[PDB]
């Protein structure tokens, strides 16, 4: 039950006729799935690893100029020549300097001048690319059983880790005692790694767009150059200075590491040491619960006394988790657990750790339940020695609805057109929504690519104004809606 204690936990409720549910996993986020007769499970994408990265381009961020040579021509004789001028490891520039009798020419005019310095790279940033077939996502499936940690077991927790690769994208987790779960994942859509570069600078790495990386203004090698003697775009990292038209000097343009760090703002940082681990991905899977079963359903209710060994606490998600221990005769037994009113004549809350059972007597089991908004009483055990605990939930139903709508809108903003697959069970409405969102997201990405959030807000305000002052009601409402949507996206973007 790892998904408690994380603020991004999200609840998927229900499966389809086929016993499957579509869930989108994310690295920061966590998913808790609850089905009628299936146990509650916690799914988290922990590791995304890109393997066998190939370098496509090396950029120079700190250059050096060493052997400066110059050649001068007298006026009306054209441009001079240097043999270093057609050497590719030399950066050269042609200019004009005043010439005359003092200079040694004999004619009065502009004399051509050329200066060359050898370009040497002292530090570079490797932009690597990974084939989409080499992504290996790692997921952990932990059955939300309530069992505590076991030292003797080879696996201390009963969470099972399953690796999903693009070729072997179908895998089943065998949760001991709970049957098995099958993940039908789609790695090829999680991230488009044919438009991404794994940009590793000195000791740090980022996941960046590939056209952005190919359009950087720095000297670059093609990536297969071991010698590094043919830098391209060398003039972006040097400056040629000709003041007063008397001399010409060329100097290096300074370590560009800080400028690159400033240019990397808005790029997610990813580890690129001891493997290419990305902790920013999302993965879409189809969860099949048909072979997943509740543990201990053929047990009898416990008749003994329970003591709380860990005081009831409220998680960030509006549920409560308590830890109880058993002092009764029936070794394995179902724990009687209800959330009722003060008079115990109505059931107000629903359990999250479905089928809490007590496998071993001297082994506490911790139960997550969702009490109702307001006052409620957690009853644990049967009448002789029964323990009744009060609790107050400080929210409101309208508040929770607003928070849920905000969370849905936020996931739409993050996983645009893929949020429809976060809790979908099939269905016509889900497919229609996903198709319309795909079309509109294509249009939005076309019309808002490479634009900052302030520009997004400005455009949203302009569009909303245009809609507000519109003669036609249909266009007015459509434009006002577009403006509101782009205002929200600009507010929520760049995180």
């Amino acid at each position: 039950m790892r998904c408690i204690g994380i603020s991004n936990r999200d609840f998927v409720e229900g499966v389809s006729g086929g016993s499957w549910v579509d869930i989108v996993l994310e690295h920061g986020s966590c998913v808790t799935t609850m089905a009628k007769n299936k146990p509650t499970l916690d799914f988290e994408l922990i590791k995304t690893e890109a393997k066998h990265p190939a370098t496509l381009r090396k950029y120079c961020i700190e250059a050096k100029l060493t052997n400066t040579t110059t050649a001068s021509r007298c006026p009306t004789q054209g441009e001079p020549s240097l043999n270093e001028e057609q050497d590719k490891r030399f950066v050269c520039k042609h200019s004009m300097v005043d010439r005359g009798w003092g200079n040694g020419c004999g004619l009065f005019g502009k004399g051509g001048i050329v200066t060359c310095a050898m370009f040497t790279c002292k530090k570079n940033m490797e932009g690597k690319i990974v084939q989409p077939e080499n992504l290996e996502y790692t997921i952990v499936i932990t059955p939300h059983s309530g069992e505590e940690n076991a030292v003797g077991q080879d696996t201390g927790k009963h969470g099972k880790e399953i690796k999903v690769t693009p070729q072997s994208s179908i895998t089943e987790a065998e949760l001991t005692g709970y049957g098995t779960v099958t993940m039908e994942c789609s790695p090829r859509t999680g991230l488009d790694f044919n438009e991404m570069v794994l940009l590793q600078m000195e000791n740090k790495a980022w996941l960046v767009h590939r056209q952005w990386f190919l359009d950087l203004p720095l000297p670059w090698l093609p990536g297969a150059d071991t010698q590094g003697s043919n830098w391209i775009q060398k003039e972006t990292l040097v400056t040629f200075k000709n003041p007063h038209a008397k001399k010409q000097d060329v100097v290096v343009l300074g370590s560009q590491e800080g400028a690159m760090h400033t240019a990397l703002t808005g790029a997610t940082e990813i580890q690129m040491s001891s493997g290419n681990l990305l902790f920013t991905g999302h993965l879409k899977c189809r969860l099949r619960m048909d072979k997943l079963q509740l543990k201990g359903m053929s047990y009898s209710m416990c008749t003994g006394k329970f003591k709380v060994v860990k005081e009831i606490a409220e998680t960030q998600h509006g549920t409560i988790v308590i830890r109880v221990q058993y002092e009764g005769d029936g070794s394995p037994c179902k724990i009687p657990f209800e959330i009722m009113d003060l008079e115990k004549r109505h059931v107000l809350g629903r359990l999250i750790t479905v089928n809490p059972i007590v496998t071993e007597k001297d082994s506490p089991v911790n139960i997550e339940a969702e009490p109702p908004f307001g006052d409620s009483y957690i009853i644990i055990g049967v009448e002789p020695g029964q323990l009744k605990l009060s609790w107050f939930k400080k929210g409101s139903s309208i508040g929770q609805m607003f928070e849920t709508t905000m969370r849905g809108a936020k996931r739409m903003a993050i996983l645009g057109d893929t949020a429809w697959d976060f809790g979908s069970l099939g269905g016509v409405f889900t497919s229609i929504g996903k198709a319309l969102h795909q079309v509109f997201g294509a249009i939005y990405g076309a019309a808002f690519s490479g634009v900052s959030w302030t520009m997004k807000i400005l455009i949203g305000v302009v569009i909303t104004w245009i809609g507000m002052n519109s003669r036609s009601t249909s266009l007015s409402v459509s434009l006002v809606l577009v403006g509101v949507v782009t205002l929200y996206l600009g507010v929520m973007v760049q995180a």
């Binding site: 991004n8 994310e26 690295h27 920061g28 986020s29 991404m196 980022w206 996941l207 960046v208 767009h209 952005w212 359009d215 950087l216 203004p217 720095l218 560009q256 800080g258 400028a259 690159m260 760090h261 400033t262 240019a263 990397l264 703002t265 808005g266 790029a267 997610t268 940082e269 902790f279 920013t280 991905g281 999302h282 993050i414 990405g445 808002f448 690519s449 490479g450 634009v451 900052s452 959030w453 302030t454 520009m455 400005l458 302009v462 104004w465 973007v493 760049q494 995180a495």
Partner: protein
């Protein structure tokens, strides 16, 4: 330079903290604030030009803000 193409708007944005997000969220707006503080003369002329260009009130403010944003960032 390379710092003038910051990779801010290239999509690809997850629910994970990107590089220099909190720092770099308002840094451009703060730059514009400092520039307008240091160069109030241009702002007055930009306001006059915006007022004289465009008839509707909305038009004038749109022009004024656009000019004051371009000025410092024209580099």
């Amino acid at each position: 330079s390379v710092a003038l193409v910051p990779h801010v708007g290239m999509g690809l944005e997850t629910r994970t903290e990107t590089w220099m997000s909190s720092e770099g969220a308002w840094k451009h707006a703060q730059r514009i604030e400092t520039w307008v503080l240091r160069h109030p003369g241009f702002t007055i002329m930009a306001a006059i030009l915006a007022y004289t260009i465009g008839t509707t009130y909305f038009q004038r403010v749109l022009i004024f803000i656009l000019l004051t944003a371009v000025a410092p960032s024209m580099t």
